[PDB]
């Protein structure tokens, strides 16, 4: 039901907007939650009210998209934000959105893709290793492909962790059978960061 972008970034002082889409969300109440790293979620108290003085946290929910608007965004607003609504079976949550408040210039990911080792193949396994470093904001989406087809099974991806230089690192693993690995021309690790994509590809050949 509920779809949110995986991340949103905004400069200090500027307005951030976090969308939350689901069919007919306009006719349900949309809840918002803020969750900082390591902490429990907390309810975002936001105004539906048309006007007055501009509110730090405002909501609009119309048609198929609900939007949380954060005005005067500052560092302490950085968190994952989740929307939710009451469905027929229970509360449905959106997937969450990491809000980064830019404290340094954007930095693009360095990506290294390693194929299965000969040694691992001999032990009747195969792991592709995609290593991602030196990025800011600390939010990436990693997609894998077998030839040109997206592959979702066997993928394990870490949450981004801050490096010593205040940029971020992450890793993604694709687990395959030797037979799966050998039966395609190539596999690719695609890393998306702030609208840009880097794709690395390896081949059993």
């Amino acid at each position: 039901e509920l779809t949110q972008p995986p991340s949103v970034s905004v400069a200090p002082g500027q307005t951030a907007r976090i969308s939350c889409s689901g069919d007919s969300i306009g006719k349900k109440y949309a809840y918002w939650y803020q969750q900082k790293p390591g902490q429990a979620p907390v309810l975002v108290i936001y105004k539906k009210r048309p006007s007055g003085i501009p509110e730090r946290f405002s909501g609009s929910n119309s048609g198929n998209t609900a939007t949380l608007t954060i005005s005067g965004t500052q560092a302490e607003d950085e968190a994952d934000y989740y929307c939710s609504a009451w469905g027929d079976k229970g509360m449905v949550f959106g997937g969450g959105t990491k809000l980064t408040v830019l404290g340094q210039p954007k930095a693009a990911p360095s990506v290294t893709l390693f194929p299965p080792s000969s040694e691992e193949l001999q032990a009747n396994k195969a792991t592709l290793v995609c290593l991602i470093s030196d990025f800011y904001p600390g939010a990436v989406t990693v997609a894998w492909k077998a030839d040109s087809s997206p592959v979702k099974a066997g993928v394990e991806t870490t949450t981004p962790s801050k490096q010593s230089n205040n940029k971020y690192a992450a890793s993604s693993y694709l687990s395959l059978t030797p037979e799966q690995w050998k039966s395609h021309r190539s596999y690719s690790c695609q890393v998306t960061h702030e609208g840009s994509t880097v794709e690395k590809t390896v081949a059993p050949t």
């Binding site: 429990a40 979620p41 290294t112 390693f114 080792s117 040694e119 290793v129 949450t159 690192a169 890793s171």
Partner: protein, 218 residues
């Protein structure tokens, strides 16, 4: 001051059971519908169960993921919410949160339920042969894959600690299997390859396992 404090979380073998309690205060507990919500490590929120207030007779409601194996209950005289978790599955592993009302306006700090065989496992260590594709001029990246160990942590050094420049050891992923895997990568001179020996030294103290894996060019 509304407080919700969750309890009972711990380690538990698949197929096992557990009971959680959330102790409430700072409001008329009896007046409120209450919720259980969970959050798997590194993942989003998933609603689990809810139970009406006293006047609606405390009818109970469950996600389709937990139908027939979780039971929600409450003791209004003790202002405690309860969640009996039976027939636990690995995919149930999460922080379990107590949340007040249809409004979900207050949340506890939660409690960790981990559904796993707590079986000590040493890693398999595989070499990641050098590639120059992603690195600066005149350099190549090589590494070690440290796979399927439990519990944390492992340590990784290079050439018995002598090689520290260009080392990046990544945080572990916790796999659906309940095991950890990590990688360590080092960027080295391309000219050094097959002159210079590179060995990753992996220690997994919890299993008393050490591996020195030599990483050679393809």
């Amino acid at each position: 001051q509304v407080q919700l404090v969750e309890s009972g979380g711990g380690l538990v073998q698949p197929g096992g059971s557990l009971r959680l309690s959330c102790a409430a205060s700072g409001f008329t507990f009896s007046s409120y519908w209450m919720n259980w919500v969970r959050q798997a490590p590194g993942k989003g929120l998933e609603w689990v169960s809810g139970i009406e207030n006293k006047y609606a007779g405390g009818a109970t409601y469950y996600a389709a993921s937990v139908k027939g194996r979780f039971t929600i209950s409450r003791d209004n005289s003790k202002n405690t919410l309860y969640l009996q978790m039976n027939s636990l599955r690995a995919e149930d592993t999460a922080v379990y949160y107590c949340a007040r009302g249809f409004g979900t306006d207050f949340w506890g700090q939660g409690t960790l339920v981990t559904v796993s065989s707590a079986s000590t496992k040493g890693p398999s260590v595989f070499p990641l042969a050098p590639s120059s594709k992603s690195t600066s001029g005149g350099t190549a990246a090589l590494g070690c894959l440290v796979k399927d160990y439990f519990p944390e942590p492992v340590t990784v050094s290079w050439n018995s600690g002598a090689l520290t420049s260009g080392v990046h050891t990544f945080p572990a992923v916790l796999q659906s299997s309940g095991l950890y895997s990590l990688s360590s990568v080092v960027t080295v001179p391309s000219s050094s390859l097959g002159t210079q020996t590179y060995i990753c030294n992996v220690n997994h103290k919890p299993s008393n396992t050490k591996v020195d894996k030599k990483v050679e060019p393809k």
